[PDB]
């Protein structure tokens, strides 16, 4: 990891439900909007009982393009997932893992760390939470962010759908990093388990 | 040997075909792992068409089922569900089967295996492995709460036939055994 660098990073970002936090103008956003593969690592605390809370999304926010996006999300039941979409006629690749994260511990909102990697070489997606590899998906027709049509935004804490903040998170994004590099499972186990 | 097999079952769009009373249905309703192989011809433009389902058809339990389905866009998928709070494990693969081709309906063969030891699901269509899913928390049909039916051509949801297929289920076989990838490439060809 000594010479690995993120293409986009943010730290210490509070977000109330429905507000989101726009990253579209950040240096590095263009790179994120074109990823063919890579790694996303996010530490957060959720204060929200919303059922589906996007931590990070990248997609097409325009009218009629509401099924064209990627997001990495958590749920109110302690689930972690992702969706990678370009309308269902093109692709809808998803993961949803139960009982992988926690909202609270000893009456306090607890930090969790999750990660997703997408590896073009072996057509594989892997999801991690809190020190564990929780799911692996292989697709013959591999896709990633550069396959979504008309990407125009990157954001924390929701997914833009026809100009509305969908899948709204509340709480704190403690640390968020996006890499073009595909990090090893050992690295992701270590960073998510810390 | 299969635990349940049927051949030449033609289904009017929306009706389904109940297998719940067949010999072997109990075993299918309790599978911890296994393999499903289905050759079919669809004659329907319905968006989502279950080929085979196993689930809980009772009121309030509409998210408790397994099905292997095709779509009108040439997709193949499966969902394994016991309400989203418990599990929702899915696959959806584009451009894997044909709904029609040279203005004609056409046969396809698909397969799904669920492998408990490897904690793995693999989906096949027409001689190709199209997706693999590995879940740390492996589930299958015996983890669904209140299974009470097995059907071709739809999924029972609160007493309604959801995801309705129309056409012919040419051959369907369900195994408790986990077939090899090579065997599934061959049988789906
Ligand atoms: C993470 C997750 O569950 N995301 C799904 C999302 C959420 O469950 C809800 O938004 C939470 O309220 O639901 C999505 O589906 C709902 C929409 O479906 C649209 O129809 C789909 C149809 O179901 C597909 O079979 C078809 O291929 O595409 C249609 C068009 O998108 C309805 O038109 C729309 O009104 C909603 O009901 C969603 O996109 O919001 C699916 C997410 O995977
Ligand atoms: C193969 C497939 O696409 N299956 C999905 C199915 C189909 O897209 C549609 O049925 C085709 O018309 O849609 C399902 O979701 C629709 C229902 O969602 C319900 O709310 C969900 C909510 O979206 C989840 O986030 C939550 O965890 O669970 C809720 C309760 O199920 C609505 O209550 C209901 O009215 C439908 O809109 C479906 O179950 O039918 C999801 C399938 O994966």
Numbering used by the authors:
A (entry chain A): 44 to 237
B (entry chain B): 48 to 236
What's the paper's own text on this?
RgNanH comprises a GH33 catalytic domain and a sialic acid-binding carbohydrate-binding module (CBM40). RgCBM40 binds to mucus produced by goblet cells and to purified mucins, providing direct evidence for a CBM40 as a novel bacterial mucus adhesin.
Protein ligand complexes were achieved for both 3′SL and 6′SL. Definitive electron density for the Neu5Ac and galactose residues was observed in the 3′SL and 6′SL complexes. In the 6′SL complex, electron density was also observed for the glucose residues, with the lactose positioned almost perpendicular to the sialic acid. Therefore, α2-6-linked LacNAc N-acetyl group may be blocked by protein residues, whereas the α2-3 linked glycan would be more solvent exposed. In the 3′SL complex, the lactose positioning would permit further extensions to the carbohydrate chain as would be present in more complex or anchored glycans, whereas these may be blocked in the 6′SL complex. The affinity of the interaction between RgCBM40 and sialic acid ligands was further assessed by ITC.
